[PDB]
A paper describes a structure:
Microneme protein 2 (MIC2) and MIC2-associated protein (M2AP) play crucial roles in the gliding motility and host cell invasion of Toxoplasma gondii. Complex formation between MIC2 and M2AP is required for maturation and transport from the microneme to the parasite surface. In this study, we report crystal structures of M2AP alone and in complex with TSR6.
The optimized crystals of M2AP β-domain alone (we referred as M2AP hereinafter) and its complex with TSR6 diffracted to high resolution (1.8–2 Å). However, structure of M2AP alone could not be solved using molecular replacement with the previous NMR model. Thus, experimental phasing with a selenium derivative was used instead. These strands form two β-sheets that make up two opposite faces, with one face being more hydrophobic than the other. The binding on the M2AP side is quite rigid, as only slight variations were identified when comparing the complex structure with the M2AP-only structure. Notable differences include the Trp-180 bearing loop region that moves slightly toward the TSR6, consistent with previous literature identifying Trp-180 and its nearby hydrophobic patch as the key region for binding with MIC213.
Author numbering: 48 to 92, 96 to 227
Write the structure that this text describes.
């Protein structure tokens, strides 16, 4: 959307702060097993990182997932001061299954709040089209935010950021290649 450039790495690490209206995009075709986690981390303030926010999606198509979790997604917020968990909350997102294709598109409208558009193509009925819901992550932009996925076997993971965003593209520890 607009001028998105692929980030040749495994996650999107922003240099500095996100100005308003730039975007980062994380896409995949699904995952193999377990929970899908979309993360936003920030630098801890020795040079380590801490979660700022997390979206965890439980597949409706894996036997044994609790009935109160299966096919649901949850937003976990963390304190931007002591890295403490503030709260968890169910959020309405179109990702229902680990066989769905999906995209996360995150931006800050005013340089302060972070929100993401979450797109999914439901595998269990891929004959409907794409669906999208927007989620406010309920945290504020900090310098040097990182965005990515943590999951067992994400299929065809690709990453993009706005042209005007400074994204790390040469750190071998981020799988940059």
């Amino acid at each position: 959307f607009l001028e998105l450039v692929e980030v040749p790495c495994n996650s999107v690490h922003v240099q500095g702060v996100m100005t308003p209206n730039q975007m980062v995009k994380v896409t995949g075709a699904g995952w193999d097993n377990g929970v899908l986690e979309f993360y936003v981390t920030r630098p801890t303030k020795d040079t380590s990182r801490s979660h700022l926010a997390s979206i965890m999606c439980y597949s409706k198509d894996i036997d044994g997932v609790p009935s109160d979790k299966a096919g649901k997604c949850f937003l976990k917020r963390f304190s931007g001061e002591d890295s403490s968990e503030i709260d968890e909350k169910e959020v309405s997102l179109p990702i229902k299954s680990h066989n769905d294709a999906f995209m996360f598109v995150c931006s800050s409208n005013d340089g302060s709040a972070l929100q993401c558009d979450v797109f999914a193509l439901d595998n269990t009925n891929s004959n409907d089209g794409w669906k999208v819901n927007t989620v406010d992550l309920g945290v504020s932009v900090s310098p040097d935010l990182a965005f990515g996925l943590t999951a067992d076997g994400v299929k065809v993971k690709k990453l993009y950021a706005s042209s005007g965003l400074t994204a790390i593209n040469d750190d071998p520890s981020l799988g940059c290649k």
